[PDB]
Amino acid sequence: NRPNRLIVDEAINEDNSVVSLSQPKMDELQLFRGDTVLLKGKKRREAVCIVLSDDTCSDEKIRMNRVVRNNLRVRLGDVISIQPCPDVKYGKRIHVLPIDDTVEGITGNLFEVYLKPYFLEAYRPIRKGDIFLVRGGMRAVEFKVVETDPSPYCIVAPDTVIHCEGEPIKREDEEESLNEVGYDDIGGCRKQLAQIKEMVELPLRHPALFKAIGVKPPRGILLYGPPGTGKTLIARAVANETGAFFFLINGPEIMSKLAGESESNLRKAFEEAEKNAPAIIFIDELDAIAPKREKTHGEVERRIVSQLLTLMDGLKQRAHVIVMAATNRPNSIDPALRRFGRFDREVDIGIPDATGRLEILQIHTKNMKLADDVDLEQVANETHGHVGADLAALCSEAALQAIRKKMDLIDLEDETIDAEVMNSLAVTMDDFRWALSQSNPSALRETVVEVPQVTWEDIGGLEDVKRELQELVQYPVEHPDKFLKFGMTPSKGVLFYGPPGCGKTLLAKAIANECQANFISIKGPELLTMWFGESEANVREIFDKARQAAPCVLFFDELDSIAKARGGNIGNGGGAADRVINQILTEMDGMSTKKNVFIIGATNRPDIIDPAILRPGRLDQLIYIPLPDEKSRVAILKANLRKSPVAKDVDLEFLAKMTNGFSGADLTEICQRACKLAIRESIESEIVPEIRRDHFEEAMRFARRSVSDNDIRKYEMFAQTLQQSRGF
Amino acid sequence: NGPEIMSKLAGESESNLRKAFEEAEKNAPAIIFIDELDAIAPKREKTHGEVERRIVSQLLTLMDGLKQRAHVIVMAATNRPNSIDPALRRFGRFDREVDIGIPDATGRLEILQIHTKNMKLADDVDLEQVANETHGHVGADLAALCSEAALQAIRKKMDLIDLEDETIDAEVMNSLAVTMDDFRWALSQSNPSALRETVVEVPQVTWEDIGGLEDVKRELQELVQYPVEHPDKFLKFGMTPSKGVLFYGPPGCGKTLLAKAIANECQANFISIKGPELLTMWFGESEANVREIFDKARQAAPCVLFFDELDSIAKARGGNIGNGGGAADRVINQILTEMDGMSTKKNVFIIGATNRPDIIDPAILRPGRLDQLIYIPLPDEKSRVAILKANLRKSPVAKDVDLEFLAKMTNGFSGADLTEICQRACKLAIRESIESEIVPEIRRDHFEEAMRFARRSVSDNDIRKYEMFAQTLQQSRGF
Numbered sequence A: 001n002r003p004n005r006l007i008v009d010e011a012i013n014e015d016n017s018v019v020s021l022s023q024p025k026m027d028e029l030q031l032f033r034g035d036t037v038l039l040k041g042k043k044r045r046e047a048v049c050i051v052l053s054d055d056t057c058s059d060e061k062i063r064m065n066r067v068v069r070n071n072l073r074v075r076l077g078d079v080i081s082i083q084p085c086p087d088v089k090y091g092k093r094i095h096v097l098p099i100d101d102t103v104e105g106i107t108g109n110l111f112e113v114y115l116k117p118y119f120l121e122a123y124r125p126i127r128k129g130d131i132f133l134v135r136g137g138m139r140a141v142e143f144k145v146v147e148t149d150p151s152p153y154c155i156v157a158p159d160t161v162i163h164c165e166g167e168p169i170k171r172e173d174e175e176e177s178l179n180e181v182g183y184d185d186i187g188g189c190r191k192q193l194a195q196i197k198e199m200v201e202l203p204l205r206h207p208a209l210f211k212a213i214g215v216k217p218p219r220g221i222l223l224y225g226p227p228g229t230g231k232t233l234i235a236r237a238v239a240n241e242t243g244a245f246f247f248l249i250n251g252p253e254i255m256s257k258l259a260g261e262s263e264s265n266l267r268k269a270f271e272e273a274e275k276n277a278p279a280i281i282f283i284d285e286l287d288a289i290a291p292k293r294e295k296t297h298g299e300v301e302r303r304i305v306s307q308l309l310t311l312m313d314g315l316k317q318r319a320h321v322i323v324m325a326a327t328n329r330p331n332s333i334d335p336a337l338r339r340f341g342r343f344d345r346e347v348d349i350g351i352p353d354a355t356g357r358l359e360i361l362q363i364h365t366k367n368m369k370l371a372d373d374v375d376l377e378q379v380a381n382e383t384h385g386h387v388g389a390d391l392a393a394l395c396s397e398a399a400l401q402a403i404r405k406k407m408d409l410i411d412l413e414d415e416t417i418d419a420e421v422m423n424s425l426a427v428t429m430d431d432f433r434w435a436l437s438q439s440n441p442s443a444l445r446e447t448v449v450e451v452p453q454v455t456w457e458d459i460g461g462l463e464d465v466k467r468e469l470q471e472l473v474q475y476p477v478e479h480p481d482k483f484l485k486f487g488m489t490p491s492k493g494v495l496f497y498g499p500p501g502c503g504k505t506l507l508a509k510a511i512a513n514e515c516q517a518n519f520i521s522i523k524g525p526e527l528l529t530m531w532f533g534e535s536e537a538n539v540r541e542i543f544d545k546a547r548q549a550a551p552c553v554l555f556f557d558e559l560d561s562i563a564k565a566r567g568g569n570i571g572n573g574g575g576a577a578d579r580v581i582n583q584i585l586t587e588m589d590g591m592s593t594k595k596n597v598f599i600i601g602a603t604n605r606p607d608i609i610d611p612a613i614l615r616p617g618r619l620d621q622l623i624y625i626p627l628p629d630e631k632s633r634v635a636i637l638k639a640n641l642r643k644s645p646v647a648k649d650v651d652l653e654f655l656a657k658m659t660n661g662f663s664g665a666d667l668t669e670i671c672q673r674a675c676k677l678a679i680r681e682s683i684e685s686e687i688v689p690e691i692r693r694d695h696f697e698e699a700m701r702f703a704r705r706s707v708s709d710n711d712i713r714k715y716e717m718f719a720q721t722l723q724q725s726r727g728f
Numbered sequence B: 001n002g003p004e005i006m007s008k009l010a011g012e013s014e015s016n017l018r019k020a021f022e023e024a025e026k027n028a029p030a031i032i033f034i035d036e037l038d039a040i041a042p043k044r045e046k047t048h049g050e051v052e053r054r055i056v057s058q059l060l061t062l063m064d065g066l067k068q069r070a071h072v073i074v075m076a077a078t079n080r081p082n083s084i085d086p087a088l089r090r091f092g093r094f095d096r097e098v099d100i101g102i103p104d105a106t107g108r109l110e111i112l113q114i115h116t117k118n119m120k121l122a123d124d125v126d127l128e129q130v131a132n133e134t135h136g137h138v139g140a141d142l143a144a145l146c147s148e149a150a151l152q153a154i155r156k157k158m159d160l161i162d163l164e165d166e167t168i169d170a171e172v173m174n175s176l177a178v179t180m181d182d183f184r185w186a187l188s189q190s191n192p193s194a195l196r197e198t199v200v201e202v203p204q205v206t207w208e209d210i211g212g213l214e215d216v217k218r219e220l221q222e223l224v225q226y227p228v229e230h231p232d233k234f235l236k237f238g239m240t241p242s243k244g245v246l247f248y249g250p251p252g253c254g255k256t257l258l259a260k261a262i263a264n265e266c267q268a269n270f271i272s273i274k275g276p277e278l279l280t281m282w283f284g285e286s287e288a289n290v291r292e293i294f295d296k297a298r299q300a301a302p303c304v305l306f307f308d309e310l311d312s313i314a315k316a317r318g319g320n321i322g323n324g325g326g327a328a329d330r331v332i333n334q335i336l337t338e339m340d341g342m343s344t345k346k347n348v349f350i351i352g353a354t355n356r357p358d359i360i361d362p363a364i365l366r367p368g369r370l371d372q373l374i375y376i377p378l379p380d381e382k383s384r385v386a387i388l389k390a391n392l393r394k395s396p397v398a399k400d401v402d403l404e405f406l407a408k409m410t411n412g413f414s415g416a417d418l419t420e421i422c423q424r425a426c427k428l429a430i431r432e433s434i435e436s437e438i439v440p441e442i443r444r445d446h447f448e449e450a451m452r453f454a455r456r457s458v459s460d461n462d463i464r465k466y467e468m469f470a471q472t473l474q475q476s477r478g479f
C-alpha cells in the first residue's frame, strides 16, 4: 500500500547529502546512479539530494545522512516520503549565511577554505533553508542558505556564484544543533549500539502503540565497561537520536548534596521524567550513588540506595520512562539493582578492537586536516590498550604537536586567528607518531575480545589438525542441520598437547580467525596472578565475558604453569589441581551446549595435567601437535619468511633437512638470527637489503635444538597414552 | 516493601511498620507481606546504623506481639535467606519456610504456556522444545524471553505492515503471530540468571540409556526403591535400610548414569554435587554451603544426593598418603558430619562415585555413611552391544552395521570409549554430508574408519588394579 513510504536509518557514506537505497528500490522508482532526488519529510519541509546505488544493504531501507535528517526534522527509524525529479536545475545567485554558534573565533573569508573545495567537482543540490555542514580548519561549521532563486532549482555548478558576508544568522530552536553527539559520533560499538536501538527505539518512538499492545518494555538498561569507552557518549547519542526527553543524573553530583537533598533530587528527576512524555533517565556513574549496601558506612547512602530501588520499582509501563545507567565498576553495584524490574538489560561497552579504534580515529580526525602520509590504519594497529578516550586524547595531542610547529614558524600571535592559515596547518604522520610515543593506554590490563589476525597461512604444516579443528568448530556453527539430523551433540572442548613451540597458540588463534569468531586468551600465569588476590569471581567473569561474545573460543594457554603450581598430579604429594582449575571445571560443566562458546586448552606438560580436564564433556578432543617433519619445516620457514626480503639463492628445503629435531619456535629463532646478522651487516656497511644464503648458514651454525630426544620419546608416549591418564 | 521502608527517614519507617501492623490487626483476617525482607532486617551483628538495628528490633517486637486473636498472617520474601537476622527465623516470628526453587523442565514449560496464552503462536512453535532448551531460566527469565520473542515478531510486522497508526486495531493484531524462529532468536539473546544455582529435579535418563549393568540395576532397585515403596517389609524384618552407596571402577563405565537412572526410576529428586564444585565453593571458606546442600536435599525428600568425581576431592592433597598429610580435609569431614547427622527415616539417599578407589579416605566407607560398595567394571562383550545400541538410538544407523562385530573388536573399551567411537563415526558421516553437499545414514564404512583410530582409555595395569580393589576395598580402613 502506497509504495512511496521509505524507512530511514543511519547512512554509510561519510559525506554530505547522498542517500543510499536497496536493490528493489532504484528499479521500483526507476532512478539511475547519479540522479537528483527530492525528499519529503514531516512538518511540510523538503530536501533535495543525490541517490547512491547500493544493493547489499537490506531488503527495504533507505540510508539518510545526519546532515539532512535535521533538514527534514526526521529521526532514526522514521518513515520518509520521496519523489524523483530527474531535471537538471542550475542556480544563479545563492544568498548563503553562517550560524553564530559554530563560527565564533574564526575570521576572514571562510569560503575560500570551506566552500571552495566542497562545491567543485561534486554537483550536489541545494534547497531553501538547508543546513549543510562543511568540515575544515580542525573544526566543523554547519551553514545556511537563506535566499536564492525559487526552491530548489539549484545544484552545484561552476556558474553558481558566491559572496562573502561575515554576518552569521542566529540559530532558532526549531532545528537541532548538528554539533551534538549522534550515532555517527560513536565508533567501535555497532553491535552494542544495535542492541541499544532494538531495546530503546520502539518503546520511545511508538509509545502509544507499545502501550496498547501490552508487552513489557526493557526499562533497566545498564551500560558498563572500562572508563572512557563511550558510555556517556552512547547514552547522550541515544537521547539525541530519539525525540525523548533526556534527564541526566550524575552520581558524584547527587552524592555531593546534603543529606535529604539528594533524595529530593532523585524524586524530582523521576517525577519530571514521568511528567515529560516518553523520556530517558540516565544515571551516569551509578556506582557513586549505589554501592553494595553491605559495604557502605553512612545511613544516608543506604537511604539513597533504597530510594533508588523504590523509584525503580515504582516505575510503571504507563510512564513510558526508560532508565539507563553507566558504571565502570559493575561488580561494585548493589546486587538488588541488577535484578528483574530494576536493571535487567546489561550492555557491555568493551574495549574497541583494531577496526573499531580505526573508526574512532576517523571520527576524531574528520575535522582535522591530515597530511598524505597519515596512515590512520597504522595508528590503529599500533594502539592496543587504547580506548575511545585514549584515542581522542592521542588525536588532540597530535593536533597540538602540529600547532606547536606552526605557532613558532608562523607567528600566530594574533588574538583571533583566521581560517586562511588554519588550513595551512596540517597534522603529519610524524605528529601522530610523537603523540603515540607519549600516551598511556588505560585498558592495557583489560582482557581482549576480538577476532585474531593470524590466518592459516601463518602456520606451516599441521594440515590434519587444521581439518580436525575445522570439523570441531566451523561445522557445528555453520551446519547445525547435519548435527541435529544425525543427533550428535558437538564436543565443546579441545586440548592441545605436545612439545613446546609447535604452534599450539597459533592453531587456536587461527581457528578463531577462520570462523570469524571472538577469541579470548587466558594464560596460566594470568590465572595464577588473578587468583592470588583470592578473587573467585574473575575466573567466573572470564566465562561470562566469553558468553556474551558467542560465537567465541575461550583459549587457556600455558596450562603447564597452572599444573606446576604444586608440581603436578603428585608434585609435593598434594594435588596441583586446585585454585582456579576446579572453578574452571565447574564453569565448563555449567555452560550450555547450545551456546557457541568453544574451549581450547594448550599444554606442553601432558604428564602433570590433571585428569579431570580430560573427562568427556569438558575437554575430550585430545589433539597432539608433534614436531614438524621435513615438509612442515619448509612450510614453517616459508611462513616465517613472508615479511622478510629473502634472497633467491636461499634453499629452504636444505635448511629443513638440516634441522631435524627443531620446533616451529626453533625455526623462527633461526630466521630471526639470520635476519639479525643481515641487520648487523647493513649497520656495518652503512659506516645489501637482502637476507642471504650466508646469513642462514651462519645462523644454522649456532642453531640449537629446544626439544631433547628423550623429550621427543616421552611426548610420543603421551601422544599414544593420554586418554588413559585418568583412573590411576 | 523493604527498600521503600528503608528509604524513609529515621523514626518514620518505624511509624510505617507500626501502622502496617495496626491496620492489619484492625482489618479482619489479613496478610502482611514484607517483600525483600533482607532490606530491612539484615544480621544485627553485620550492620552499621543504629536506625537499622531499631528497625530490626521493632520488626521483632511486632512479630512477637502478634497474637492468635489478631488472625494476621505475616509472609515475607527474600532471595538471600542466609542474610536474614537469625532472630526472625525462630519460633513465633518466622517458623514456616518455603523454598520457591528454580522451575524444572515441566514447570518452565508451564510458565511458558502461562506467559504465551495471550500471545498468538504459529503452528511450528514448540513450547516444550523451548522449555527443554532453557536451563538456568527462572519465571522472570521466561517472561522476558516470551516478551522478547513477541517484540521480535512485532519488529518484523511493524516494517512489513505500516503500523504507524496511533491506536492500532485488533484486526491486524491477530495477523501478527509469533513464529518458532522468533522464540529461537529470543533464546539466542537471553542471559539465564540461575545458571550457578543447584538443580533439584527428576533426571531424564532412564535405564534404557544404560547398556548392561543389569546386576547393579537390580541392586540399586533393592537399595532405593524397596525402602521407599515397601516400608512394611523392612519394619517386619526389622532391618534399617542402608542410606549410602559408593560407586567405584574404571572411568567412563556409567557411574553418573547409574545414579541418575536410579533417581529417575524412583521418580525422586536428584542433586548432583561434583568434586570440583565442592573444592571451588570451599575456597571461599564457606562451611555453610555444604550444609545447605544437605539441607536442600532434606526438603527434596525423597531425594538422591549424588557426589560425583570424588577423585577430585581425594586428590586435593594427593590421597590417603599424598604429600604425607591427609587429603581427607575441608569438605569431606563436613560431608561425613552431615551424613552422620541425617535421620534414617528421611528418604534422602546418598550416592558417591569415584574412579580412584586407592585414595578414597576410609571414613567414607564406615557402616552408616557409605557401606554399600558397588563396583562397576568395564562392559563385557554383550554389555558393549547394549551400550552401542543405547548410544545409537538417536542416530540413523544403516542396517549393514554389525554392532556385535564392533563389540568383539573392542575389548578394553569403556562406555565412554564406545560413545567416542559412535561420535567419531557420526562426525565422519557429517563430513561426508558436508562434502557431498558441495547419504543421511551413518554406514558400516564410517564405523570401520572410526574403529581404525579408536583408542583404549583404561590400561591393562589399570584393569588389574581395579580388579584388585574390586575384591579388597572393604578392608581399606584400618591400615
Ligand SMILES: Nc1ncnc2c1ncn2[C@@H]1O[C@H](COP(=O)(O)OP(=O)(O)OP(O)(O)=S)[C@@H](O)[C@H]1O
Pocket (backbone or CB within 6 Å): A185, A186, A187, A188, A189, A226, A227, A228, A229, A230, A231, A232, A233, A234, A326, A327, A328, A360, A363, A387, A388, A389, A390, A392
Ligand atoms: N567509542 C567511542 N567513539 C568515539 N568517541 C569515543 C568513544 N569512546 C570514547 N570516546 C571519546 O572519549 C570521550 C570519553 O568520554 P566517555 O567515554 O563518554 O566517558 P565514559 O565512557 O562514561 O567513561 P567514564 O565516565 O570515565 S567511566 C568521549 O566524550 C568521546 O569524545
Ligand SMILES: Nc1ncnc2c1ncn2[C@@H]1O[C@H](COP(=O)(O)OP(=O)(O)OP(O)(O)=S)[C@@H](O)[C@H]1O
Pocket (backbone or CB within 6 Å): A458, A459, A460, A461, A462, A499, A500, A501, A502, A503, A504, A505, A506, A507, A602, A604, A636, A639, A640, A663, A664, A665, A666, A668
Ligand atoms: N607451525 C608453525 N608455523 C609457523 N610458526 C610457528 C609454528 N609453530 C611455531 N611457530 C613459531 O613459534 C612461535 C610460538 O608458537 P606457539 O603457537 O606459541 O607454540 P606453542 O605450542 O604455544 O609453544 P610456546 O610455549 O608458545 S613457544 C610462534 O609465534 C611462531 O613464531
Ligand SMILES: Nc1ncnc2c1ncn2[C@@H]1O[C@H](COP(=O)(O)OP(=O)(O)OP(O)(O)=S)[C@@H](O)[C@H]1O
Pocket (backbone or CB within 6 Å): A615, A616, B209, B210, B211, B212, B213, B250, B251, B252, B253, B254, B255, B256, B257, B258, B353, B355, B387, B390, B391, B414, B415, B416, B417, B419
Ligand atoms: N553403560 C553405559 N551405557 C551407555 N553409555 C555409557 C555407559 N557408560 C558410559 N557411557 C557413556 O559415557 C559417558 C560417561 O558416563 P558416566 O556415567 O559419566 O561414567 P563415569 O563412571 O562417571 O565416568 P566419567 O568420569 O563420567 S567419563 C556417558 O554420558 C555415556 O555417553
Ligand SMILES: [Mg+2]
Pocket (backbone or CB within 6 Å): A231, A232, A284, A285, A326
Ligand atoms: Mg562518563
Ligand SMILES: [Mg+2]
Pocket (backbone or CB within 6 Å): A504, A505, A506, A557
Ligand atoms: Mg604459545
Ligand SMILES: [Mg+2]
Pocket (backbone or CB within 6 Å): B255, B256, B257, B308
Ligand atoms: Mg560421570
